[PDB]
Write an enzyme that holds these catalytic residues in place. Structure first.
Site, mmCIF file in Angstrom:
data_model
loop_
_atom_site.group_PDB
_atom_site.id
_atom_site.type_symbol
_atom_site.label_atom_id
_atom_site.label_comp_id
_atom_site.label_asym_id
_atom_site.label_seq_id
_atom_site.Cartn_x
_atom_site.Cartn_y
_atom_site.Cartn_z
ATOM 1 N N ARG A 181 7.068 4.559 0.244
ATOM 2 C CA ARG A 181 7.996 3.671 -0.493
ATOM 3 C C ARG A 181 9.360 4.312 -0.713
ATOM 4 O O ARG A 181 10.396 3.648 -0.838
ATOM 5 C CB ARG A 181 7.321 3.254 -1.833
ATOM 6 C CG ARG A 181 6.077 2.423 -1.448
ATOM 7 C CD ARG A 181 5.192 2.005 -2.573
ATOM 8 N NE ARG A 181 4.108 1.113 -2.104
ATOM 9 C CZ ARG A 181 3.112 0.607 -2.827
ATOM 10 N NH1 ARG A 181 2.906 0.907 -4.117
ATOM 11 N NH2 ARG A 181 2.283 -0.299 -2.291
ATOM 12 N N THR A 239 5.231 4.871 -8.772
ATOM 13 C CA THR A 239 5.143 5.682 -7.530
ATOM 14 C C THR A 239 5.020 7.127 -7.942
ATOM 15 O O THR A 239 5.819 7.573 -8.775
ATOM 16 C CB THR A 239 6.423 5.443 -6.681
ATOM 17 O OG1 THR A 239 6.374 3.994 -6.348
ATOM 18 C CG2 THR A 239 6.589 6.314 -5.442
ATOM 19 N N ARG A 251 -0.413 5.428 0.266
ATOM 20 C CA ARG A 251 0.219 4.144 0.056
ATOM 21 C C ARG A 251 1.637 4.251 -0.609
ATOM 22 O O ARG A 251 2.516 3.452 -0.202
ATOM 23 C CB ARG A 251 -0.578 3.198 -0.850
ATOM 24 C CG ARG A 251 -1.938 2.823 -0.170
ATOM 25 C CD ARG A 251 -2.497 1.689 -0.972
ATOM 26 N NE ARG A 251 -2.672 2.024 -2.409
ATOM 27 C CZ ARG A 251 -3.820 2.517 -2.907
ATOM 28 N NH1 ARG A 251 -4.908 2.703 -2.168
ATOM 29 N NH2 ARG A 251 -3.882 2.774 -4.216
ATOM 30 N N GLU A 252 1.770 5.085 -1.558
ATOM 31 C CA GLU A 252 3.012 5.145 -2.315
ATOM 32 C C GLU A 252 4.081 6.050 -1.754
ATOM 33 O O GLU A 252 5.298 5.678 -1.950
ATOM 34 C CB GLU A 252 2.726 5.632 -3.743
ATOM 35 C CG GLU A 252 1.780 4.626 -4.493
ATOM 36 C CD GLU A 252 1.477 5.079 -5.871
ATOM 37 O OE1 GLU A 252 1.797 6.128 -6.413
ATOM 38 O OE2 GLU A 252 0.803 4.187 -6.464
#
Length: 137
Positions: A25, A1, A21-22
């Site tokens: 997280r 990440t 996307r990361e």
């Protein structure tokens, strides 16, 4: 990440999509830790930005910074005509306030982040595009 510090409008398409996307997280990771009874004081948060070991943890008490950056990432994805499915910023008001700090990186920290992105492109510039154009060589 990997969380970047550079302007989102300057990211290569691949890097923009990866961070979109990361970054979120981190929110899920904090939720998991909160449910396990952890507090911000249980983490070793570096005093300065770093890449590598301890990178994600550096942002555990900087979730407002991340929330604001996720806003920018979504907007940049849409600006480039990318088809992303979640266009809403995650609600993080459920996470304890001690994790929801803000952050203003100095230019020397941004330079560290920028250098990593540059280094990755230089490895194989054909893998990267900007608005779909191969401008990296």
């Amino acid at each position: 990440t990997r969380i970047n510090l550079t302007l989102v409008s300057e990211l290569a398409d691949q890097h923009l999509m990866a961070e979109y996307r990361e970054l979120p997280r981190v929110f899920g990771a904090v939720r998991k830790h909160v449910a396990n009874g952890k507090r911000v004081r249980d983490f070793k948060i570096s005093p300065t930005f770093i890449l590598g070991a301890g990178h994600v943890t550096f942002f555990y008490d900087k979730l407002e910074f991340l929330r604001k950056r996720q806003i920018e990432l979504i907007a940049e994805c849409l600006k480039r005509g990318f088809n992303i499915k979640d266009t809403t910023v995650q609600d993080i008001s459920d996470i304890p306030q001690e994790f929801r700090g803000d952050y203003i990186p100095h230019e020397a920290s941004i330079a560290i982040s920028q250098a990593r992105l540059d280094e990755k492109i230089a490895q194989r510039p054909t893998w990267y595009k900007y608005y779909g154009k191969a401008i990296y060589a």
